[PDB]
């Protein structure tokens, strides 16, 4: 059961579909409309049901062409408020109704962020973006807000005519609104049953260009050439995808790039994948996170965690296809030195939270905890090096890609449970149980902390990186002189990268090795996000005040958690910058994205 639910469970009851009818209110920032449910009764008798809300407005709900009663219960935090209603008519096991629900949105609703014309790129139009994961689509419309349920949709949205929605679904036609000629209806449908997390919306001033046979890239008109150049890689990966996974079952894979707050690297949406503009570093090595949106198609949209507490399934999953997709554009030397970069990333994650931390386990007990407070990369990287040591345990890749296309296979349009997956993989390998009871499960799954066991890494792509870590590490200042640009002649994007997160382990360092580094290696140059990201991190630690305004720049400038979170705390323990931090966010605090807000003033103490 989903104890980040307030909704009758699967068990009682089921939503098959969603017809959603709705107008967005730029003035107002709401979304008004109509949440049309057909619920199928999983219970003989059944006389009512609850549905999960938050920050809603309910006018009235409708079964049969005729109002019923409903209540909200008392909000219950993060959770949101429980709505629950009278059928008029009991139910038998099976029987199926359709509920519609009018309601609106609140402008504070944690699932929408409304950019005002000036927070866009083209100065002249407002924009609205949705994100629904974990437990926000209950801030849209009333559901069952849980990935154990799995629904199709239908939807017609209006909006403003000069403007373009597009949704997680097949774009479906648009016409006049019939009730306002200053607007256009869009329409939209998704076939494939999807848990209701994976409902997604932007209304903004859109544009396009196709990249593949199947891909069309979105944003404002300023970003469209850059994005298309930074993703088109894009039909090959899927190739690579289809070919580990199974057939891409979805139509289209459309990309949407975002304005610079939206709160993630990606955004796994079907049929339109969201991204961070933070990716156009122009040379397309950031690409790693469309392998893994992309790889989403099979790990997460197909094979569905039943609740957040089995979150890793979705992850780890992802993790290890994405590793597997650049590995085969790039070489399996390549999928190592991202695999070993992903421990490090792990390492960070239980130092950051205590090794003994609740949230450094793999399966995660969320009961009276809420879902973005817990986020963090132990699922992805624990999730990753469980399914790495495995891999290497029974066999090696091409093995244990068996087992992962006959998992996608196994449990394609379903929800599933950590034993879920480790039934099937003792099943799928029941010719080597003897080597899979040699893993310590209780600990893999359970435990706190590092995983109990490393698994083996190629060193090729990585050694160059921890070598000159270590020549700064160890260098004194009669050592600064012997650096020089040529250090970094035969280190791509990636070493410097992997270099600066090598460094940024042992930080602070002294403030004159720091100010060395800039000398001669200008990173203060460097726009590729990931790199610049480390880079300002081991300035502010190391206590450059140069770099302060720097820092302070970024973390506004963009809004990806990934960078605006470390970001802000570092400049928060940092002395110097302290109240300048503290001061920046409360200015920029209502014109961030809700739930960024949320968590960066949890992290600063304000
Ligand atoms: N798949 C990209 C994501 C965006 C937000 C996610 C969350 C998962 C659980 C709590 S927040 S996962
Ligand atoms: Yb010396
Ligand atoms: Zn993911």
């Known amino acids: 059961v989903d104890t980040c639910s307030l909704a009758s469970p699967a068990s009682v009851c089921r939503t098959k579909h969603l017809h959603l009818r709705c107008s967005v209110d730029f003035t107002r920032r709401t979304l008004t409309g109509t949440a049309?449910?057909?619920?199928?009764?999983?219970?003989?008798?059944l006389r009512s049901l609850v549905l999960d809300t938050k920050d809603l407005t309910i006018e009235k709900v409708v079964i049969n062409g005729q109002e019923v009663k409903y209540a909200?219960?008392?909000?219950?935090?993060?959770?949101?408020?429980?709505?629950?209603?009278?059928?008029?008519?009991?139910?038998?096991?099976?029987?199926?109704?359709?509920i519609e629900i009018s309601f609106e949105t609140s402008p504070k609703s944690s699932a929408l962020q409304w950019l005002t014309p000036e927070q866009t790129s083209g100065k002249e139009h407002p924009y609205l973006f949705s994100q629904c994961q974990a437990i926000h689509c209950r801030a849209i419309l009333p559901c069952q807000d849980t990935p154990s349920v799995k629904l199709t949709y239908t939807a017609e949205v209006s909006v403003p005519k000069e403007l373009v929605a597009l949704m997680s679904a097949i774009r479906d036609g648009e016409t006049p609104d019939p009730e306002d000629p200053s607007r256009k209806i869009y329409k939209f449908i998704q076939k494939v049953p999807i848990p209701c997390y994976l409902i997604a919306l932007v209304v903004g001033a859109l544009e396009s260009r196709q990249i593949g046979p199947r891909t069309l890239v979105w944003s404002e008109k300023e970003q469209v050439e850059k994005s298309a150049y930074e993703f088109s890689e894009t039909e090959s990966m899927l190739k690579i995808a289809e070919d580990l996974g199974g057939p891409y079952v979805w139509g289209q894979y459309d990309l949407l790039v975002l304005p610079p707050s939206f709160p993630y690297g990606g955004m796994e949406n079907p049929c339109l994948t969201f991204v961070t503009p933070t990716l156009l570093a122009g040379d397309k090595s950031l690409s790693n996170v469309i392998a893994h949106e992309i790889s989403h198609s099979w790990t997460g949209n197909l094979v569905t965690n039943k609740t957040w507490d089995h979150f890793w399934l979705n992850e780890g999953h992802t993790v290890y296809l994405e590793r597997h997709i650049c590995g085969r554009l790039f070489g399996e030397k390549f999928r190592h030195f991202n695999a070993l970069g992903g421990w490090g990333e792990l390492q960070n994650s239980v130092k950051t939270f205590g090794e003994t931390h609740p949230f450094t386990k793999l399966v995660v007990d969320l009961t009276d905890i809420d879902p973005d407070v817990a986020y963090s990369s132990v699922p992805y990287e624990k999730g990753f090096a469980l399914l790495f040591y495995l891999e290497?345990?029974?066999?090696?890749?091409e093995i244990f890609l068996g087992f992962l296309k006959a998992y996608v296979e196994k449990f394609s349009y379903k929800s599933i449970t950590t034993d879920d997956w480790k039934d099937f993989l003792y099943s799928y390998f029941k010719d080597k149980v003897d080597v899979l009871n040699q893993?310590?499960?209780n600990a893999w799954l359970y435990s706190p902390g590092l995983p109990p066991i490393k698994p083996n890494?190629?060193?090729?792509?990585?050694?160059?990186?921890?070598?000159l870590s270590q020549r700064w590490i160890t260098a004194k200042e009669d050592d600064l002189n012997s650096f020089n640009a040529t250090d970094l002649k035969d280190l791509s994007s990636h070493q410097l990268n992997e270099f600066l997160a090598q460094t940024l382990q042992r930080a602070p360092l002294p403030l004159g090795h720091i100010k060395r580094m800039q000398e001669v290696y200008n990173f203060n140059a460097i726009n590729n996000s990931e790199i610049r990201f480390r880079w300002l991190r081991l300035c502010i630690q190391s206590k450059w005040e140069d770099a302060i305004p720097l820092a302070l720049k970024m973390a506004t400038e963009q809004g990806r958690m990934k960078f605006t979170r470390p970001l802000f705390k570092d400049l928060a323990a940092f002395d110097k910058s302290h109240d300048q931090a503290v001061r920046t966010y409360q200015e920029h605090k209502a014109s961030m994205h809700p739930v960024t807000a949320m968590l960066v003033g949890k992290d600063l103490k304000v």
Not at 72 to 96: D, F, H, T, V
Request: proline share 5%; glycine share 8%.
């Open 36 to 45: 049309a449910l057909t619920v199928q009764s999983q219970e003989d008798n």
């Open 392 to 397: 290497q345990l029974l066999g090696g890749p």
């Open 439 to 441: 893993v310590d499960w």
């Open 72 to 98: 909200l219960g008392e909000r219950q935090s993060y959770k949101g408020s429980p709505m629950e209603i009278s059928l008029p008519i009991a139910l038998s096991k099976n029987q199926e109704i359709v």
């Open 457 to 467: 890494y190629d060193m090729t792509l990585t050694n160059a990186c921890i070598a």
